[PDB]
Amino acid sequence: NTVSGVNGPLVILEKVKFPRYNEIVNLTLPDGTVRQGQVLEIRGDRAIVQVFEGTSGIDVKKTTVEFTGESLRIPVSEDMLGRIFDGSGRPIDNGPKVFAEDYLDINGSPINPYARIYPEEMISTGVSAIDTMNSIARGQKIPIFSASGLPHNEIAAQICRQAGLVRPTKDVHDGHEENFSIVFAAMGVNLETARFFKQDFEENGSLERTSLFLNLANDPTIERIITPRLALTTAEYLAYQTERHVLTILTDMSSYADALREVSAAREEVPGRRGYPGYMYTDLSTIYERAGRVEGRNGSITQIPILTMPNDDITHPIPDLTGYITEGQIFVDRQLHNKGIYPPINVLPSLSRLMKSAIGEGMTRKDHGDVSNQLYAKYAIGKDAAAMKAVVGEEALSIEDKLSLEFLEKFEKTFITQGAYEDRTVFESLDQAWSLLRIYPKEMLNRISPKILDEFY
Amino acid sequence: NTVSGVNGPLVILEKVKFPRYNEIVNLTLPDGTVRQGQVLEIRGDRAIVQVFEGTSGIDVKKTTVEFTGESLRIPVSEDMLGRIFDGSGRPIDNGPKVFAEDYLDINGSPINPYARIYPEEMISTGVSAIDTMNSIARGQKIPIFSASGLPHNEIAAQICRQAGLVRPTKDVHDGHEENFSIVFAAMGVNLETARFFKQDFEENGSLERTSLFLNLANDPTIERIITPRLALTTAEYLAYQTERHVLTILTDMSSYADALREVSAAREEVPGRRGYPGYMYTDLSTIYERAGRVEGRNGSITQIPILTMPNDDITHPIPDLTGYITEGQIFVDRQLHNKGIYPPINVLPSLSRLMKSAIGEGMTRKDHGDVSNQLYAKYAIGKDAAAMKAVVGEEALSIEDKLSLEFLEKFEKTFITQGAYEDRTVFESLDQAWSLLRIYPKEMLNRISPKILDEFY
Amino acid sequence: NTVSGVNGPLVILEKVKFPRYNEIVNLTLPDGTVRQGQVLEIRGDRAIVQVFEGTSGIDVKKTTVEFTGESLRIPVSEDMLGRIFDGSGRPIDNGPKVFAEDYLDINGSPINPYARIYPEEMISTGVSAIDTMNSIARGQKIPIFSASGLPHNEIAAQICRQAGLVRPTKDVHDGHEENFSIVFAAMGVNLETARFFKQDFEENGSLERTSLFLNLANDPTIERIITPRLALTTAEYLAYQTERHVLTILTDMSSYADALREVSAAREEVPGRRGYPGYMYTDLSTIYERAGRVEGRNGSITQIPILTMPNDDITHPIPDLTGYITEGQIFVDRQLHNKGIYPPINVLPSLSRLMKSAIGEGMTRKDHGDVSNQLYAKYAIGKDAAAMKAVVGEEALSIEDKLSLEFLEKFEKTFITQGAYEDRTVFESLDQAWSLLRIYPKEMLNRISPKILDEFY
Amino acid sequence: AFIILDEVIKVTNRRVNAIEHVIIPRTENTIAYINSELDELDREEFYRLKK
Amino acid sequence: YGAIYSVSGPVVIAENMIGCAMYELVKVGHDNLVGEVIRIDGDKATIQVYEETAGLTVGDPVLRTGKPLSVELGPGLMETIYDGIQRPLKAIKEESQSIYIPRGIDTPALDRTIKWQFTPGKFQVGDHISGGDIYGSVFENSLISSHKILLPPRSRGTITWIAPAGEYTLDEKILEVEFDGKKSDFTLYHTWPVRVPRPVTEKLSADYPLLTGQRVLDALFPCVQGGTTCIPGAFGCGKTVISQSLSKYSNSDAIIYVGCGERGNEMAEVLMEFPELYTEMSGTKEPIMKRTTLVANTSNMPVAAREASIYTGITLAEYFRDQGKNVSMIADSSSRWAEALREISGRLGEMPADQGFPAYLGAKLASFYERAGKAVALGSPDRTGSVSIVAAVSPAGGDFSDPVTTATLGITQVFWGLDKKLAQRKHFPSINTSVSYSKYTNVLNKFYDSNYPEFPVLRDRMKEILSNAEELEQVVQLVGKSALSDSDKITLDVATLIKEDFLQQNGYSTYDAFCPIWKTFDMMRAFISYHDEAQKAVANGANWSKLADSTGDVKHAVSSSKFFEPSRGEKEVHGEFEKLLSTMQERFAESTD
């Protein structure tokens, strides 16, 4: 009906009891622009709305509302690739709107025809330190944990450029046979970097294959959270109807987390630990839900969320909850970056717990899981030996440890390091693993069965 | 007669303001299930009730309420003993009626007749580590600070079960002319554990010496804090009127504390550090007020509360507040349980602050005090020696350190270690002590008067 | 009307809406006492007031009000020199009646004609430890950061007795041109501490040129916050009318902050981090703005507030806000006091932002600043090298390093050690510095230009 | 044996001084910094709830 | 009846809800969503609605059904996968064409087309009957026909009608009970409230060991059927691999696998893996499946379901318990249930006070636990049934200082560690004697004494070797090694052997599908014998180095033990390990002189 009040950016409507839940309402403001808002909650003879464009202009008696009568749903086309959108899917280049062939729900709770077949075939991201150690399977969602003090935007970028150049490597491996498409969603990221993302798609020649949703921080909070839901829904349509391998790259979760946090400052719903909502978990889980093998089991959606730790620790609420919903984690680190390493990836807390089962010898090798296991134990000792080395002197060193100190550096500067443009064969990756291990006797090995070792070493 | 609402454990019944505080009320259900509860708060035409059994499932119109007219009190009797009760003191034995002779308040004090006369005269637990090294005399409240890494329930039982077999031996030496009774209170307990205590007692023939009150952990929290309160009141009556020395065993203070933190969910009362009350002091104190010498002072109420560190943190709020109030503390550590010593009481930071005050003769010996000094000091030195041995080797170690080492192994493996069904009277303990100390010459024994040292090496 | 309630130091008045903001009202108590209060909040037919007198003992319909109709202002006069006050402007030692020649409201902004031309003249107390490393300009604010277990009171006293002897010497150099007055405000200090300050002004013969405001901690918390402000309003008046440099000593800042905190957890505002106010910054800012040159450009207000850390850290909310607002800090350390160094002011992290501005060349050398840069560097490295000497011995201690060890000792025992009647001058400080610095080679002394170095080694 | 004994004691002497001065106070100060933030997250919450 | 007052998140509030209780089953809106009144505030009831909202408006009716929310336990539970609200997942796949539950769609709690073979009980006409007494049985699978049809807990009367043997539906009545007038007619399914502990004849103390099938889990502290256990996780240390692996390897009559709030990929894995793999009970035609009743919740589905998960799951263990079936309930992970509880705490607006976590949290964790245990089966013919609760605990913030873990350790009597550093190094599951305890130990080693083994003696020494190693390692790190006693070196060496053979095993031991107690005992027995001979050997004089060099052949042989499988000696006692003891004795002879 009309504004009773506005409390924070949240706008308090006084209105008669009829609307749908998540029903779009259009607020008529006196300035030549009408705007849409969604009822966040519906209550007894009032509804609290956060208006999707702007944050100012609402008046007491100079406002009018009319109920659209329809809750927000994303209008989906599979012709949506090769178009530039914003966070509401409106054009910024004038002309390419989302348009439709079907209308599907933004939550993806109605359809949810996610297959009960567990991640199957191999995926790589062309970065050796990712591929071998925490090996990606289709439908597997494994987070990229980063920290600021980093060119963390450059690491995300690298993965976006690399995605789709990997795919002929994968065809040959027989972990892909079908088209590859990219769904790209941006939330609260710098101007320069938004041009880097467009440019990386352009180079690849996959601009046609990708959709860009661009959302800045000067576009509202509620609207920020909707953006990946639009993207996600379109990916689900790609994966289900046309049996495609869909990669959605969703950056930046941190920006998404803040937005959730700013709200509930006038809701009846109350915020829990560290001022984060307690149903923050619930919010993450809605995003995360569209990910997994689709029914038809020739398509899948693989999802890579990008998280920068804003405080740097991994026990901060943003990473801690995410790591739990996902199956393992991938750690980027400040320390490698300082020495002068790119892409700087620490592997010591990095483990994916569903890695072994997915992969098999037919597109990897049987030693892929064994050779990875050896390299973690040796790297771990090398790291403790280093810390002790500083404090006491070379008094606590032993033969294995001196060897381990060299191993650390060897691995860091040959294995993990590679150019932005560079991409890597998995089979190649595995010969370079063996090479590093060749400086240790075989009697000191034990995370590999003696049968397996004898064949490939 | 009309339930207004339920907000968690706390139930709001809407009926008039004419009831008094802690008056039992009866919720009459159409299920034929009468549940009693006690009013926490009374306000104008509503009272807030916590139901002992269950807390929800009551209709908002098909229910009636009746007021008892009696505030909660324990029917206390000397014929009550040797029987297994719930957390409201009602038989689960399938035995006869509770019986009364008086009705005594369980609110915190019945008549509070806690003396302005300090502790003397030994109370024997039948565990060597506690009795000799940390002498407890009646009225003293020394807690056992244990952890979940130890078997806290099994050690607690041991103290009860071996206690009161010390007593014929005391009667002969003339320590006790009046009888010995145990009041055992178990909280939020597991079913196997509840049964375990009864079976242990049955085996020793300590069953009819004690009353056991079991509150199970499926029983709501409010019942659980009521349990020790019931126990403590019963004990104050046996101790005052028929003059008996009573040892009260209360496990687990950590579960009682949790209940207290747990209630508050519609109260306007806020907790303090780590979520535990600011008034956590107050609640501890409440148990603590029933403990001390009774008026007439040949009977006493002696309290040993048992506190379990859940995470091995001595800076955890529960032990800290308690520790300040209590006359010393007993520390039990994980390390000794691991070597396989049982009981594994390290007497390294354990203290009794009124150690001298307890002993005498006729239930101790004169030589008790001097020995306590020799064994503690030698033991501490024994721990220090173990670390040095690892470094220097066995063929490069000192004489003084070698002696200290030998003492550590024997001390642990003979004094502290005793069998499950082996009672260690204080007289028995003191002899074993002289064998251990003998290995040192007289030249290295000196916190002992030469008079003693000449009697017993 | 009359008093509805009192919640803590907030008084809930029911009265009409006609009073202005900070309008005085008077409460007529039935006890034969009148109490004054000022409106903190005005609302729809009620007001919430903080009373200067009392904090409790406020009734309902026995207690009535009459509104004064006059907002809170200080009668500021210039013939207030030599008169003794308390923390409200009543005499406690029978100093002259306040009168009036102007009235200024307290808001931290009287007439506010503070600086837009920076200070550049120099004030010296004759303390090298202070002056050299922290060059105090004529309207800069540099606090004293000390901690518990220190004689912060004694150092504040050094300044006050030695100021007003050094200043006429500085008058000739053209460091000064005009008389000095001290306005001492004590907050929340002991009788014993308060007398000490008064003793120092008598002792010197500057009791007629000082204003003393004494607030004790047992006087209301509301009285305590008005005490620094009252002093400051007066201070601005003396600066304006009679063109003197006014030094304000505001001791102790922690006491003031404790007052603000009680009126912010008893407020309906939620306080900031560590239970310390959310507008704690603001409250502090009010003092701090009132610094610099005052119109007619020959009077000024210069500020040294005194802070003792009540928790021994610069981690704490008080040091961190304090230090941001002011322009430097003068640091005192515990180690130096323990050893027998008085004044124990350490020079390790003591810093002056407006050092450059403060030094000149028409009353100080230009080499004051160059030589300062060397002392700060050299001392800083030397302190760190000493701790390092302890660890390493002489196996990572150089010849050059030995020289830094000697500079450190000598600086401590000479530069920092001077009695509480010892007066220096700037030229002497530079000369003594030059000598110590002399053992270092030319190469070592590299943060000062060759022109300077060569002339004066 | 003497000459060696002379070298080893010098190293063992440096290590005691190093653990005592540097290591232990670093563990104290870091622990404390984190404690102070930590207690405040728990407390402010209760105030937020109450408001 | 009621009129919707407000819809905030998936929480619906409805005014005008009188003669309503606090666990009522309700149909919410005009959409007829399944829902439950958790609490009430005056007239206004706060209802958790188990299907999502996206279009439910205010002022739609709320119809109370006149009874609590319960779950259905009948026949056909086995060899089917359900959710946590318990609607068949499989039936959902065909009819809705949506693999996972669609919005606005409702399906009843069990399949209503399936027919079962009823065979008569041990009652006839005019007989007095009681609850948990066996009224019949249904041949439910091929592995097990042990599915007893009982008269419900809290029922007694006289049976008016007993139907004869034959084929019936589970909606097609076969029993009438008359107590005082018609109590109700009964069918093959029976209803049970998921908010109450299921009645029992008596609880009995646990004293019968289950063998996990993992040598390491048995070796340090034995599992018991009837018990409670914590296994630490960290969400990237292969906690899933060992959960699913334990489930296969442990052997009970019925197993209930409860995914609390999972990846969705992990749940999918178990659904696929189990019919492909075999049982050790000789199961055929989807072997493992026939033995499992599976509760599948992902975290991406509604929060109500995920609350409901554990409770439904425990009731399923309990139902089978009354029949006299021994149950293993593996619930994974209990920390995700707590995370759902923290969610409810903030959505209704109830106070959290357990470290930013619920008021109720500590008590709800205990309530779940007490429903597990060993008992004399419900009904008077007397059987033994048991429930062992294996509940995974894992971080919810800190490493063990999170609320979840603190509460759970209080109440658990069995705890088996898992260290992160060893997890990354691949030596999981790592049981640390300081981070592990069993209170059941003393009754359990005395049980194994009766069975044949010397077991209690081996326990103490196993503990001693691990225990001294941790303390000596701390001197090694700081001081270094330039000296470390002859005895101390031995302890370190032997402890490595124990790590490698026992602690490391999960796709690295070619036999691990089920490991007997005797074999574990025999393996550990060789390790301990090697230890005592070695320490004696340095003391009676013989260098440490000569002693390593001569032990030689046997030392390797114990190193290699782990791959070896029963194939010599008995069916549980292994000859290679028996041979080993005697050869060891010969090595000592060479080594001392």
Side-chain angles (χ1 to χ4, degrees), chain A residues 88-109:
Chain A
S88 278
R90 313 186 276 256
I92 49 177
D93 294 281
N94 193 70
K97 323 179 196 48
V98 296
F99 306 111
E101 298 177 46
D102 301 84
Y103 247 108
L104 299 184
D105 202 69
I106 51 176
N107 290 311
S109 306

mmCIF file of all heavy atoms in Angstrom, chain A residues 88-109:
data_model
loop_
_atom_site.group_PDB
_atom_site.id
_atom_site.type_symbol
_atom_site.label_atom_id
_atom_site.label_comp_id
_atom_site.label_asym_id
_atom_site.label_seq_id
_atom_site.Cartn_x
_atom_site.Cartn_y
_atom_site.Cartn_z
ATOM 1 N N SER A 88 20.541 -8.107 -11.849
ATOM 2 C CA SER A 88 19.133 -8.314 -11.944
ATOM 3 C C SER A 88 18.899 -8.897 -13.316
ATOM 4 O O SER A 88 17.754 -9.105 -13.723
ATOM 5 C CB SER A 88 18.493 -6.914 -11.768
ATOM 6 O OG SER A 88 18.463 -6.715 -10.393
ATOM 7 N N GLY A 89 19.940 -9.155 -14.088
ATOM 8 C CA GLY A 89 19.832 -9.585 -15.475
ATOM 9 C C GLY A 89 19.432 -8.609 -16.529
ATOM 10 O O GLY A 89 19.518 -8.966 -17.719
ATOM 11 N N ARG A 90 19.125 -7.365 -16.104
ATOM 12 C CA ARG A 90 19.001 -6.233 -17.023
ATOM 13 C C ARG A 90 20.229 -5.963 -17.863
ATOM 14 O O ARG A 90 21.300 -6.291 -17.416
ATOM 15 C CB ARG A 90 18.783 -4.920 -16.252
ATOM 16 C CG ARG A 90 17.757 -4.947 -15.171
ATOM 17 C CD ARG A 90 17.533 -3.525 -14.598
ATOM 18 N NE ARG A 90 18.597 -3.322 -13.565
ATOM 19 C CZ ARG A 90 18.458 -3.371 -12.213
ATOM 20 N NH1 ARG A 90 17.295 -3.550 -11.536
ATOM 21 N NH2 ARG A 90 19.651 -3.249 -11.522
ATOM 22 N N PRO A 91 20.073 -5.419 -19.073
ATOM 23 C CA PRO A 91 21.188 -5.185 -19.884
ATOM 24 C C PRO A 91 21.886 -3.935 -19.429
ATOM 25 O O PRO A 91 21.215 -3.009 -18.896
ATOM 26 C CB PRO A 91 20.636 -5.100 -21.305
ATOM 27 C CG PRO A 91 19.207 -4.489 -21.029
ATOM 28 C CD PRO A 91 18.770 -5.159 -19.710
ATOM 29 N N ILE A 92 23.252 -3.902 -19.708
ATOM 30 C CA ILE A 92 24.074 -2.727 -19.501
ATOM 31 C C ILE A 92 24.639 -2.274 -20.767
ATOM 32 O O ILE A 92 25.285 -1.249 -20.864
ATOM 33 C CB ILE A 92 25.204 -3.037 -18.496
ATOM 34 C CG1 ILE A 92 25.929 -4.317 -18.851
ATOM 35 C CG2 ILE A 92 24.588 -3.114 -17.151
ATOM 36 C CD1 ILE A 92 27.090 -4.614 -17.933
ATOM 37 N N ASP A 93 24.426 -3.094 -21.842
ATOM 38 C CA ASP A 93 24.951 -2.816 -23.132
ATOM 39 C C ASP A 93 23.790 -2.426 -24.008
ATOM 40 O O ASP A 93 24.046 -2.097 -25.170
ATOM 41 C CB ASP A 93 25.693 -4.056 -23.703
ATOM 42 C CG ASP A 93 26.913 -4.321 -22.836
ATOM 43 O OD1 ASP A 93 27.891 -3.565 -23.087
ATOM 44 O OD2 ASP A 93 26.881 -5.243 -21.997
ATOM 45 N N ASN A 94 22.584 -2.314 -23.390
ATOM 46 C CA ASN A 94 21.297 -1.980 -24.008
ATOM 47 C C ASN A 94 20.944 -3.045 -24.947
ATOM 48 O O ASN A 94 21.619 -3.243 -25.973
ATOM 49 C CB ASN A 94 21.110 -0.530 -24.646
ATOM 50 C CG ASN A 94 19.669 -0.163 -24.989
ATOM 51 O OD1 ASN A 94 18.929 0.027 -24.065
ATOM 52 N ND2 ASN A 94 19.378 -0.120 -26.326
ATOM 53 N N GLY A 95 19.840 -3.795 -24.782
ATOM 54 C CA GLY A 95 19.470 -4.731 -25.747
ATOM 55 C C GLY A 95 19.432 -6.158 -25.193
ATOM 56 O O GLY A 95 18.384 -6.749 -25.264
ATOM 57 N N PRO A 96 20.533 -6.819 -24.604
ATOM 58 C CA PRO A 96 20.414 -8.196 -24.229
ATOM 59 C C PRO A 96 19.939 -8.392 -22.819
ATOM 60 O O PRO A 96 20.748 -8.389 -21.880
ATOM 61 C CB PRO A 96 21.888 -8.691 -24.430
ATOM 62 C CG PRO A 96 22.809 -7.430 -24.242
ATOM 63 C CD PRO A 96 21.912 -6.237 -24.530
ATOM 64 N N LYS A 97 18.601 -8.613 -22.725
ATOM 65 C CA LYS A 97 17.884 -9.030 -21.558
ATOM 66 C C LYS A 97 18.017 -10.549 -21.449
ATOM 67 O O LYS A 97 18.442 -11.245 -22.355
ATOM 68 C CB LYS A 97 16.410 -8.580 -21.364
ATOM 69 C CG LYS A 97 16.157 -7.138 -21.860
ATOM 70 C CD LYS A 97 14.694 -6.661 -21.706
ATOM 71 C CE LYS A 97 14.308 -5.412 -22.506
ATOM 72 N NZ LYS A 97 14.708 -5.431 -23.929
ATOM 73 N N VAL A 98 17.453 -11.148 -20.329
ATOM 74 C CA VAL A 98 17.517 -12.597 -20.161
ATOM 75 C C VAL A 98 16.582 -13.318 -21.131
ATOM 76 O O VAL A 98 17.073 -14.272 -21.726
ATOM 77 C CB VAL A 98 17.405 -13.025 -18.742
ATOM 78 C CG1 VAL A 98 18.601 -12.490 -17.932
ATOM 79 C CG2 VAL A 98 16.006 -12.674 -18.048
ATOM 80 N N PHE A 99 15.312 -12.829 -21.255
ATOM 81 C CA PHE A 99 14.287 -13.537 -21.977
ATOM 82 C C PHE A 99 14.176 -15.002 -21.618
ATOM 83 O O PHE A 99 14.665 -15.451 -20.580
ATOM 84 C CB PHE A 99 14.574 -13.416 -23.461
ATOM 85 C CG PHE A 99 14.725 -12.038 -23.903
ATOM 86 C CD1 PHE A 99 15.972 -11.482 -24.335
ATOM 87 C CD2 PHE A 99 13.615 -11.207 -23.895
ATOM 88 C CE1 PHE A 99 16.046 -10.101 -24.648
ATOM 89 C CE2 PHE A 99 13.701 -9.826 -24.074
ATOM 90 C CZ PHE A 99 14.888 -9.260 -24.554
ATOM 91 N N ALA A 100 13.273 -15.797 -22.292
ATOM 92 C CA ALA A 100 12.701 -16.957 -21.706
ATOM 93 C C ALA A 100 12.340 -17.969 -22.780
ATOM 94 O O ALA A 100 12.187 -17.587 -23.924
ATOM 95 C CB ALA A 100 11.478 -16.609 -20.959
ATOM 96 N N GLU A 101 12.249 -19.228 -22.354
ATOM 97 C CA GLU A 101 11.613 -20.287 -23.058
ATOM 98 C C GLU A 101 10.773 -21.053 -22.078
ATOM 99 O O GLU A 101 9.732 -21.651 -22.393
ATOM 100 C CB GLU A 101 12.670 -21.281 -23.643
ATOM 101 C CG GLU A 101 13.637 -20.598 -24.707
ATOM 102 C CD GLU A 101 14.675 -21.650 -25.168
ATOM 103 O OE1 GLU A 101 14.201 -22.775 -25.448
ATOM 104 O OE2 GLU A 101 15.884 -21.255 -25.213
ATOM 105 N N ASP A 102 11.268 -20.910 -20.848
ATOM 106 C CA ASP A 102 10.635 -21.432 -19.704
ATOM 107 C C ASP A 102 10.865 -20.507 -18.620
ATOM 108 O O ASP A 102 11.832 -19.674 -18.705
ATOM 109 C CB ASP A 102 11.104 -22.892 -19.294
ATOM 110 C CG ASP A 102 10.839 -23.874 -20.442
ATOM 111 O OD1 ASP A 102 11.684 -23.991 -21.390
ATOM 112 O OD2 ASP A 102 9.790 -24.563 -20.374
ATOM 113 N N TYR A 103 10.049 -20.505 -17.539
ATOM 114 C CA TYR A 103 10.171 -19.724 -16.331
ATOM 115 C C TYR A 103 10.447 -20.723 -15.262
ATOM 116 O O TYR A 103 9.625 -21.687 -15.193
ATOM 117 C CB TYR A 103 8.854 -18.985 -15.893
ATOM 118 C CG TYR A 103 9.011 -17.481 -16.009
ATOM 119 C CD1 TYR A 103 8.377 -16.789 -16.983
ATOM 120 C CD2 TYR A 103 9.891 -16.792 -15.143
ATOM 121 C CE1 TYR A 103 8.368 -15.417 -17.059
ATOM 122 C CE2 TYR A 103 9.860 -15.345 -15.149
ATOM 123 C CZ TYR A 103 9.075 -14.737 -16.083
ATOM 124 O OH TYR A 103 8.954 -13.352 -16.032
ATOM 125 N N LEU A 104 11.554 -20.512 -14.511
ATOM 126 C CA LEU A 104 12.026 -21.432 -13.421
ATOM 127 C C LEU A 104 12.314 -20.554 -12.207
ATOM 128 O O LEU A 104 12.588 -19.376 -12.295
ATOM 129 C CB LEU A 104 13.361 -22.125 -13.770
ATOM 130 C CG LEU A 104 13.426 -23.004 -14.971
ATOM 131 C CD1 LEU A 104 14.856 -23.669 -15.055
ATOM 132 C CD2 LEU A 104 12.499 -24.202 -15.110
ATOM 133 N N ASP A 105 12.087 -21.208 -11.072
ATOM 134 C CA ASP A 105 12.200 -20.630 -9.771
ATOM 135 C C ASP A 105 13.666 -20.372 -9.356
ATOM 136 O O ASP A 105 14.627 -21.077 -9.645
ATOM 137 C CB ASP A 105 11.426 -21.455 -8.658
ATOM 138 C CG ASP A 105 11.122 -20.528 -7.458
ATOM 139 O OD1 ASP A 105 10.260 -19.616 -7.673
ATOM 140 O OD2 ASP A 105 11.734 -20.698 -6.398
ATOM 141 N N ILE A 106 13.794 -19.232 -8.678
ATOM 142 C CA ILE A 106 15.125 -18.668 -8.288
ATOM 143 C C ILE A 106 15.741 -19.484 -7.215
ATOM 144 O O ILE A 106 16.916 -19.393 -7.078
ATOM 145 C CB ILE A 106 15.138 -17.186 -7.723
ATOM 146 C CG1 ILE A 106 14.095 -17.034 -6.576
ATOM 147 C CG2 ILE A 106 14.840 -16.105 -8.844
ATOM 148 C CD1 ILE A 106 14.101 -15.647 -5.903
ATOM 149 N N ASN A 107 15.025 -20.323 -6.428
ATOM 150 C CA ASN A 107 15.600 -21.021 -5.299
ATOM 151 C C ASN A 107 16.089 -22.381 -5.838
ATOM 152 O O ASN A 107 17.027 -22.928 -5.338
ATOM 153 C CB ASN A 107 14.583 -21.382 -4.172
ATOM 154 C CG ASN A 107 14.077 -20.115 -3.392
ATOM 155 O OD1 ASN A 107 14.929 -19.326 -2.986
ATOM 156 N ND2 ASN A 107 12.750 -20.042 -3.063
ATOM 157 N N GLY A 108 15.357 -22.951 -6.885
ATOM 158 C CA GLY A 108 15.687 -24.232 -7.495
ATOM 159 C C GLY A 108 15.196 -25.344 -6.605
ATOM 160 O O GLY A 108 15.675 -26.446 -6.789
ATOM 161 N N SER A 109 14.330 -25.000 -5.580
ATOM 162 C CA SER A 109 13.706 -25.941 -4.689
ATOM 163 C C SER A 109 12.567 -26.715 -5.410
ATOM 164 O O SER A 109 12.612 -27.937 -5.312
ATOM 165 C CB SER A 109 13.319 -25.337 -3.334
ATOM 166 O OG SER A 109 14.395 -24.700 -2.685
#
